Amino acid sequence: SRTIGIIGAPFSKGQPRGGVEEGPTVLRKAGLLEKLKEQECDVKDYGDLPFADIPNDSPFQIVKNPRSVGKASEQLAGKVAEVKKNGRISLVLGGDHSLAIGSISGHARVHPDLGVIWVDAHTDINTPLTTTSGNLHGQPVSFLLKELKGKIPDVPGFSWVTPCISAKDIVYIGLRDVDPGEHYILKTLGIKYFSMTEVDRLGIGKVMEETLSYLLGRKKRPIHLSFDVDGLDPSFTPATGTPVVGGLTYREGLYITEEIYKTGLLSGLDIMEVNPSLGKTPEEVTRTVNTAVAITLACFGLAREGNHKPIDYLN
Amino acid sequence: SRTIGIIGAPFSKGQPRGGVEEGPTVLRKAGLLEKLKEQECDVKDYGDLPFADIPNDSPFQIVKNPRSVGKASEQLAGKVAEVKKNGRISLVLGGDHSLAIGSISGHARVHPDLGVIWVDAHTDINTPLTTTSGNLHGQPVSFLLKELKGKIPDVPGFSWVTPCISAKDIVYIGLRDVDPGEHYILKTLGIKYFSMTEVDRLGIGKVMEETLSYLLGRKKRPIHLSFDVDGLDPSFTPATGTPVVGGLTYREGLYITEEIYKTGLLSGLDIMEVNPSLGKTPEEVTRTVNTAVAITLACFGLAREGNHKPIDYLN
Amino acid sequence: SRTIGIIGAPFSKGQPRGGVEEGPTVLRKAGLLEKLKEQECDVKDYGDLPFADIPNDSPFQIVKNPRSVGKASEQLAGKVAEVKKNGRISLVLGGDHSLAIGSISGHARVHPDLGVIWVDAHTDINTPLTTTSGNLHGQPVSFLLKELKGKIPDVPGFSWVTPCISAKDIVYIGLRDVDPGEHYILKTLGIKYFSMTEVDRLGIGKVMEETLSYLLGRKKRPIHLSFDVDGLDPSFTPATGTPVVGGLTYREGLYITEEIYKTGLLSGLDIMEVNPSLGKTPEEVTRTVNTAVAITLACFGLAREGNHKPIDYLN
Ligand SMILES: NCCC[C@H](N)C(=O)O
Ligand SMILES: NCCC[C@H](N)C(=O)O
Ligand SMILES: NCCC[C@H](N)C(=O)O
Ligand SMILES: [Mn+2]
Ligand SMILES: [Mn+2]
Ligand SMILES: [Mn+2]
Ligand SMILES: [Mn+2]
Ligand SMILES: [Mn+2]
Ligand SMILES: [Mn+2]
Structure with missing residues (x-):
């Protein structure tokens, strides 16, 4: 039985574009809970986290909205740990990807042996010192890696953070826009990744x-899937802040998640970067949201070959 | 030499939407016969079957237009058997997929050892008792399987039917929208299928x-290809009644058929569910029809690598 | 270090449609040189070749603009040999594909052991006698093959040509529209090709x-990549004269070139058939040009997994 703990995370300060904080609203409105219940799912809604406003939040060097970002993740981390303690797969509806710091942190408090699969067009592994944009949704992973401890300065709002994953406990899928410093870190820490080049090959x-x-070979352990919708090609998820052409197909998106579901080890899930405001047309918004929902449903059992209850349908 | 027997089957009562009965007209108008003759083809047109009107045809339980559907297939079955007896590959231009009952039935009368390849987004294997829509284009296969005998009630218009294929003589390709009862039947009868998940894998x-x-391993035998145009992604065949995203590509569509042609065993072919009325634009109609024609031409020899006559082109 | 020699070849008389002679202008305007320099590239611009006008140029049999086509290639051949002698990878911006005669001819003068990879929807191997269109952009390869010597009549403007490649030194990728005579030549000379059917398979x-x-197995040697933009699907490169559906994807396009770059053997490159005038919308033009640029950048090092300088980014 796949029991889920829904967590709305209407947050956008990890990047410039507003509208992504509407992600939880549009997904829910799309009937995500209803459709999940339509499956073999036990769904508990923990609501939308109220991210109080932090008016005084000047940049730290070039890093923008550090206290807002830091606080939102700290709050989310607490909520996620609570859902895990209740024996449910945490499902975080974003919101920009900076939230991964909180989501993966809170998940690891309950399940320290977790392995992470990161589906994204980007590695989001810039440090506060390698970033050129200053946008925190491009730095979550650097705050989480134990090996990067010593390279992460004391950024306001993140004193509560404690790296919880090693370079060897994460796999990237879908990469096609990686910054120079980010690539350096990939090769230096020996991080496992399947860029679009590897998927093609x-x-x-x-x-x-x-x-x-790679992640379950030595032994089985909880899986955390952080899915950035811009990992899929913009033809499928156009309403997102940092789209890059040549992405994963709708089919590949569903394949990744169907396979993860089949492991029976999905423990934590993030559906990030859905920004309804960036849809060039009303149809681009529904196309994006519909795909995000489809990906989510696959994570929890929906199979393209079909699904049936433990009953005799012919009798 | 690939000799073909064209059979227009302007029928739509196996489903709700009208316009699919125009399939034979639009395909022919697209120059299908001319282009076939442009190849190494011996083409004989048997015309469009005149499906007399059956005004009195109330539902059987929830099954709609049973007598109309039953009669059209009975007629088509007779025509197909006639074409086969003339030593020609029957080419049925649909028309909704309920016609597969007649097409495969008539084909089996002449070639009982036939094997079926079903390209579709759906399994169309609901029984009159498992169907929820009541649309007969979602039940053809159940009427044809010998193993499902005993589960098929006496539906008006189908007393002439005699299951002619076993669970082991059919392979599905392209599945992505299968009903619960249908999935049960798939797993219970051990039917071979390659859903979109298997194609991705x-x-x-x-x-x-x-x-x-799987079908020709033990021995060679006639092949029947029932191709539902909604098996291909809606980006290629939008003008169809039951489109589902994440389908087979144009390329995969041509690959399937090129490979089937190369066997030299194609015996019967169905081109179904082309509905010109459902094209959101004039271009969507031509896109759909053009793709349907391309698929057809590949079944009869057209290869992407090129084709040439048994002559010395350089001399 | 990858040093490049840019050669603009604003030529269109190898085919009917004007506008393709604007290819060098739109690509340059797209910042191609700047972006190349943005990489690890040493870029030298040799400018646009001034293809003087040849007013008196009646067809040779059905072959159109023979003297214009012949002269443009003769000029380009000289320029390419000059760039190679300067120790730089020649980068020819077309212009229609008839220019391949000059590009590959001039390249072979300096590097006779070169191997050619031809990415195209077409084989462009018609002879002046097998062509039905008379358009010379559909015949470049026939003029270059040593084995086809004796089948090539004395066409005005090409007396300077001397076949420089054997059937075994070229590989085709992307074929989907090959003429009968062309297919005959493929099978008769034993030319290695991967049509769209092989790519699917x-x-x-x-x-x-x-x-x-196939090309580097026996030994390493310079590679010449002649890339016709219509090799990629029209959904990616619509602004081109002879588009054919079911082409190579954006991803496959980048894969081909990333792999060629990794060999360290790229010696000559052609970016052909970009016609800004054929874009049905301003967006179709930018889509085409943007893709052409992307393909070019991949040939010279840009990797989807990321790139970084030989420095310590974390320090
Ligand atoms: N999440 C997108 C991050 C994009 C870019 N690498 C950055 O660091 O801003
Ligand atoms: N041919 C489409 C059938 C769709 C659905 N499974 C049904 O039974 O109506
Ligand atoms: N470059 C396109 C060539 C198209 C056709 N095979 C021809 O010979 O004209
Ligand atoms: Mn991203
Ligand atoms: Mn991300
Ligand atoms: Mn269907
Ligand atoms: Mn069907
Ligand atoms: Mn071409
Ligand atoms: Mn070409």
Whole structure:
């Protein structure tokens, strides 16, 4: 039985564009809870986290909205740990990706042996010192890696953070826009990744076999899937802040999640970067939201080959 | 030499939406016969079957237009058997997919050892008792399977039907929207299928190798290809009644058919669900029809690598 | 260090449609040189070749603009040989594909052991006698093959030509519209090709492994990549004269070039058939040009997994 703990995280200060804080609203409105219940799901809604306003939040060097970002993640981390303690798969509806700091942090408090699969067009592994944009949704992973401890300065709002994952406990899928400093970190820490080049070369089937084998080979452990919707091609998820052409297909998106579901190890899930305000047309918004919902439903059992209850349908 | 027997089947009562009965007209108008003759083809047109009107046709339980559907298939079955007896590959231009009952039935009368490849987003294997829509284009296969005998009630208009295929003589390709009862039947009868998940995992190349090996491994026998245009993604065939996103690509569509042609065993072909009335724009109609024609031409020899006559072109 | 020699070739008389002679202008305007320099590139611009007008140029049989086409290639051949002699990878911005005669001819003068990879929806291997269109952009390869010597009549403007490649030194990728005579030549000379059917069957990964192994297996030698933008699907490069559906994806396009770059053997490059005048909308033009630029940048090092300088980014 797949029990879920819904957590709305209407937050946008990890990046410039507003509208992404509406992600939880549009997804819910799309009937996400209803459709989840329509499946074999036990759904508990923990509501939308109220991210109080932090008016005084000047940049730290070039890092923008550090206290707002830091606080939102700290709050989310607490909520996620609570859902896990209740024996439910945490489902965080974003919101920009900076929230991954809180989501993965809170998840690790309850399940320290977790492994992370990061589906994204970006690595979001810039440090406060390697970033050129200063946008925190491009730095979450750097705050989480134990190996990057010593390279992360004391940024206001993140004193509560304690790196909880090692370079070896995370796999990237979908990369196609990686910054120079980010690439350096990838190669230096020996991080496992399947950029779009590897997906083209091997096919999504082998990519997933290798990804799960890499993380679950030595032993089984909880899986945390942080899914940035811009990991998929803009033809499928156009309403997002940092779209990059040549992305994962709708089919590959569903394949990744169907395979993750089949492990029975999904422990935490993030659906990030859905920004309804960035849809060039009303249809682009629904296309984006519909795809995000589809990806979510696949994570919890919906299979393209079909699904049926433990009953005799012919009798 | 590939000799063809064209059979127009302007029928739509297996489903709600009208316009699909125009399929034969638009395909022909697209120059299908001319282009077929432009190849190495011997083409004989048997015309469009005149499906007399059956005004009195109330539902059987929830099954709609049973007598109309039953009669159209009975007529088509007779026509197809006639074309086969003339030593020609029957080419049925639909028309909704309920016609598969007649097409495969008539084909089996002449070639009982036939194997079926079903390209579709759906399994169309609901029984009159498992269907929720009552639309007969979602039940053709149930009427044809010998194993499902005993589960098919006496529906008005189908007393002439005699299941002619076993669960082991059919392979599905493209599935992505299968009903619960349908999935139950798939798993219970051990039916071979390659849903979109398997195509993503293995690639269309291995899918076809396995499909042909599965049906022709023990021995060679006539192949019946029932191609529902909604098997391909709506980006290629939008003018259809039951479109589902994440479908087979134009390329995969041509690959399936090129490979089937190469066997030299194509015996019967169905081109179904083309509905010109459902095109949101004039271009969507031509896009759909053009793709349907392309698929058809590939079934009869047109290869993307090129084609040339048994002559010395350089001399 | 990858040093490049830019050569603008604003020529269109190898085909009917004007506008393709604007290819060098739109690509440059797109910041191609700037972006190349933004990489690890040493860029030298040799300018746009001034293709003087040849008013008196009646057809040779049905072959159109023979003297204009012949002269433009003769000029380009000289320029390319000059760039190679300067130790730089020649980068020819077309212009229609008839220019390949000059580009590959001039390249071979300096590097006779070169191997050619031809990415295109067409084989462009018609002879002046097998062509039905008379358009010379559909015949460049026939003029270059040593084996086709004796089948090429004395066409005005090409007396300077001397076939420089053998059937075994070229590989085609992307074929989907090959003429009958062309197919005959393919099979008769035993030319290695991966039509769209082979790409579907094997996947672009194996296609490239086989392509490079085929050309570099016996020994390493300079590679000449003649890239016709219509090799990619029209959804990515619509502004081109002879588009054909079911082409290579944006991803496959980048994969081919990333793999070629990694060999360290790219010696000559052609970016052909970009026609800004054929864009049905301003967006179709930018989409086409943007993709052409992306393909070019990949040939010279830009990797989707990321790039970084030989420095310590964390310090
Ligand atoms: N989440 C997008 C991050 C984009 C860019 N690498 C940055 O650091 O801003
Ligand atoms: N041919 C489409 C059938 C769709 C649905 N499974 C049904 O039974 O109506
Ligand atoms: N470059 C396109 C060539 C198209 C056709 N095969 C021809 O010979 O004109
Ligand atoms: Mn991203
Ligand atoms: Mn992200
Ligand atoms: Mn269907
Ligand atoms: Mn169907
Ligand atoms: Mn071409
Ligand atoms: Mn060409």
